[PDB]
């Protein structure tokens, strides 16, 4: 007989490496119906020991570019007891295999690839050979685009709708502006729910913050218009202040602020969106 | 899914002759005899119920036919395609087989 093929009975009978996963928050084997382990002993003394595992491994995420963020989550393992002078691990030729990559439970992420490495880590007990597998994940924009980006832009456009209402419609325009500012506060509040309580601004935070300023500038614009309309009422040899600055005429052209805003606000928002998306998608 | 998972197989070593044709024994005999190492490929933290006793039964026929049943709460993967949600329909698999023994 060239090989003894055995179930989990002799796993506890023979010596087994004390391999443990360093970055595991919680891991557990499988025991249904029987222990999901396998042993195979060859005549030359080669032992092959396989087991099924499910590991909850920690992965410190940098969410500055969220939802345009990419991560390389690790999975590290080593011998718990035996230092580098006692046990040495080694990757095989084709060590990390995968089946159907995009049939997995990754809903918000897509699997780009993986890479394995080995190193030596010094601890109080000794130096240990640590074997790492990094999985590269890239976030997908669909859910967050549905949830935050589209509603915020739509509320900004709803704020723009106020510019086309008659300025004498004071309750209508005031309610429209303040209501748009409310729905922004609420959208900001709910945009953060998926994330942890990090203390830095993300891309989504920046977008929602700029959408807030555009909805607040619209409300302040109507307030100023209403107050000023109803409630209140030397190579040239030119002088440099006349040549450069403007003391001539100027304000007077204040009733046309709605006409100015109707074109100004969409242009500013379009420029902001263009620079934002280009910068986050292509330049960085 | 809560299941009675039943398996049966021949074991010539466990042949006997006696007053009874079948030995409806305590489940403790299962740990003492060989049983298949069946596992669920798409399972996710299944449970073998153990109240009051281990919910297993073993029966040995005089010709060496083993019947071995266990109660399980299998918890398996059902990958879903939610494009047609809530008008969507799925086919959840339940796949099982031996872990250590090849074909």
């Amino acid at each position, epitope marked *: 007989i060239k090989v003894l093929r055995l179930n989990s009975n002799m796993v506890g009978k023979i010596w087994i490496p004390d391999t443990f996963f360093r970055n595991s928050k919680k891991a557990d084997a499988h025991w249904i119906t029987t222990p999901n382990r396998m042993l195979r002993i060859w005549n030359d003394g080669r032992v092959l020991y396989t087991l099924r595992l499910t590991i909850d491994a920690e992965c410190q995420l940098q969410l500055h570019n969220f939802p345009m963020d990419e991560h390389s989550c690790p999975l590290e393992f080593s011998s718990y007891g035996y230092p580098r002078e006692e046990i040495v691990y080694q990757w095989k030729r084709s060590s990390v295999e995968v*089946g*159907d*990559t*995009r*049939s997995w439970r990754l809903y918000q992420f897509s699997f780009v690839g993986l890479r394995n490495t080995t190193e030596v880590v010094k601890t109080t007990s000794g130096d240990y050979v640590v074997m790492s597998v990094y999985f590269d994940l890239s976030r997908r924009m669909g859910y967050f685009t549905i949830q935050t980006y589209i509603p915020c832009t739509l509320i900004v456009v709803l704020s723009w709708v106020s510019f086309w209402i008659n300025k004498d419609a004071v309750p209508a325009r005031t309610s429209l502006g303040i209501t748009t500012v409310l729905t922004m506060t609420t959208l900001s509040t709910i945009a953060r729910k998926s994330l942890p309580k990090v203390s830095y601004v993300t891309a989504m935070d920046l977008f929602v913050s700029v959408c807030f300023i555009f909805v607040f500038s619209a409300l302040v614009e109507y307030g100023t218009l209403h107050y000023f309309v109803s409630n209140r009422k030397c190579l040239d040899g030119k002088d440099c202040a006349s040549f450069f600055c403007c003391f001539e005429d100027c304000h007077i052209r204040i009733a046309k602020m709605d006409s100015y805003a109707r074109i100004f606000f969409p242009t500013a928002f379009c420029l902001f969106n263009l620079v934002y998306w280009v910068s986050y998608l292509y330049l960085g | 899914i809560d299941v009675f998972f039943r398996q049966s197989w021949k074991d010539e070593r466990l042949k006997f002759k006696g007053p009874m044709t079948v030995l409806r024994l305590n489940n403790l005999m299962a740990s003492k005899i060989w049983t298949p190492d069946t596992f669920f*490929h*798409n399972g996710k933290k299944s449970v073998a119920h153990n109240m009051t006793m281990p919910n297993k039964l073993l029966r040995i026929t005089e010709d060496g036919t083993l019947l071995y049943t266990m109660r399980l709460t299998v918890r398996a993967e059902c*990958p879903m*395609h939610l494009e047609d949600f809530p008008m969507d*329909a*799925h*086919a959840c*698999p339940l*796949k099982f087989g031996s872990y250590a023994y090849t074909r």
Partner: nanobody, 108 residues
Framework: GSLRVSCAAS????????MAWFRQAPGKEREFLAA???????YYGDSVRGRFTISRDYAKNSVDLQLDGLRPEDTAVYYC?????????????????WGQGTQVTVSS
């Protein structure tokens, strides 16, 4: 004789769909030859069990079928199919995507 039939998919990610191979000679209904699931599990028809072998490349989004022991009763049109297996995995109705088909003939 030995032969290999490949089927590459484009325009949609068929990795997460069960991918199958079918046969249809003239004056015959489309019959199931082979299939492979997302979990690398292979099903074969009783007529072709042990002769033909189905494999899949998920990175390339393709399904291959190696035909061995070809016989002159085997000549037919071979179709590549893919879909979610609902009420099926052995019936043509459950597959929502099909290929053009390829003719195969054996001459003794």
């Amino acid at each position: 004789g030995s032969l290999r039939v490949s089927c590459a998919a484009s325009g949609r990610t068929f990795t997460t769909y069960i991918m199958a191979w079918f046969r249809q000679a003239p004056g015959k209904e489309r019959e199931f030859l082979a299939a492979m699931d997302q979990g690398r599990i292979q099903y074969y028809g009783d007529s072709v069990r042990g002769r033909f072998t189905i494999s899949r490349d998920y990175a390339k989004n393709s399904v291959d079928l190696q035909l061995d022991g070809l016989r002159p009763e085997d000549t037919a049109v071979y179709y590549c199919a893919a879909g979610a297996g609902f009420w099926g995995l052995r019936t043509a109705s459950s597959y929502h995507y099909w290929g053009q088909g390829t003719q195969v003939t054996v001459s003794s």
